[PDB]
């Protein structure tokens, strides 16, 4: 009956940020002290909650969203932020209640020559709504002539491969990110801390 946080944080593979992963966590006892007393995270920021008080809290459901971005984009995973990530890949609402946790994953997610498996959406006409996920790969029309699935002039592939190399500057290295959203509805609480 322990919440499967190891499944999320210690997953062998992480999703690309554009195709971000969501794991519904429910009907379990959650020990957030396992995460909070661990000095393995470069980012651990909470909104609407105190990180120490998490063990004495109950929620209807907890969502754990995970993906990979550069270190310099981790700042975009917070309410009220702008940039290619917050705008076209993963958007937190202004009323966000939850925690954002990150750590450098260069030893797992970068390879000599470049890891072209991690991607981000570079092109999108309008910003994503909060918690919206767009996995479309259709050719992006940057002019008046239709693309018709053909890449070329004013016709872009919307996603860009990060191409993580171990020789990248630390802010350009891959970072694994887990976002915990805490949901509180007029329904029974399925996720409580150790009581």
């Amino acid at each position, epitope marked *: 009956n322990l919440c499967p946080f190891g499944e999320v944080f210690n997953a062998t593979r992480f999703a690309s940020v554009y195709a971000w992963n969501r794991k519904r966590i429910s009907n379990c006892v959650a020990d957030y002290s396992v995460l909070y007393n661990s000095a393995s995270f470069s980012t651990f920021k909470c909104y609407g909650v105190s990180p120490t008080k998490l063990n004495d809290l109950c929620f209807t459901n907890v969502y754990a969203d995970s993906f990979v971005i*550069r270190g*310099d984009e981790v700042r975009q995973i917070a309410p009220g932020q*702008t*940039g*290619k990530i917050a*705008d*076209y890949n993963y958007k937190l609402p202004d009323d966000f209640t939850g925690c954002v946790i990150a750590w450098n994953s260069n030893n797992l997610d970068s390879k000599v020559g*470049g890891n072209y498996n991690y991607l*981000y959406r*570079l*092109f*999108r*006409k*309008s*910003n994503l709504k909060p918690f919206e996920r767009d996995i479309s790969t259709e050719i992006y*029309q*940057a*002019g*008046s002539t239709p693309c018709n699935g053909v890449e070329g*002039f*004013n016709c872009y592939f919307p996603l*860009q491969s990060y*191409g993580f*190399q171990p*020789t*990248n*500057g*630390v*802010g*350009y290295q891959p970072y694994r990110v887990v976002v915990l959203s805490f949901e509180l509805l007029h329904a029974p609480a399925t996720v409580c801390g150790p009581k």
Partner: antibody
Amino acid sequence: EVQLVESGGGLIQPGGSLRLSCAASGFTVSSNYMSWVRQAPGKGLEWVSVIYSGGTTYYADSVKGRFTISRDNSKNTLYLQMNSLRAEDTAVYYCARGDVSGYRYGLDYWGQGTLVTVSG
Amino acid sequence: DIQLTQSPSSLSASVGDRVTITCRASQGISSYLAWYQQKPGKAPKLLIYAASTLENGVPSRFSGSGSGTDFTLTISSLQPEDFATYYCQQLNSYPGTFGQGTKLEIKR
């Protein structure tokens, strides 16, 4: 045929305001990342500002709080509102299609440039 | 914070020569780099993007190479119209720093 035609440059006193225009043809301004790059006399190039299709804007530290990038989708035009101008803002200002951060394509099409002289 | 060191500042060459212009980034920037050519009184012109992709319309004698910190621009057989200033540009992060420039001038 891609065209980036600029206007708005001229002589202005320090503390004054100027607005630059860049009418485009051959692509849709509002669908692209669009930048302003400037070149002081006898100097190199310096990126100034960018506007995203979704509306996000970024500025180089030296112009932050004084400049405003904007666009008009109906006129297919890019604008640069330059307030509190300083003598060091003296440069030929170019509009260009593209972005400079996580954007491998670079700035493929540039305008002819428009000289802005800030002097007392 | 990325510093771009372009070398040389000046390059003396003759028509038909093979020329190389170097750009060094202070940290690894993968293939986020572009090369431009600029002539006096004219706007810059994109030659190479994504460190090694030749921009459409640009002559095949122009070629880019490198990934990470060390980038080169090669012009395999110099033509009179190639005597101009060349600039590298990092496309990794704001402010998309340009190199100092390389003036390609005529040997005599």
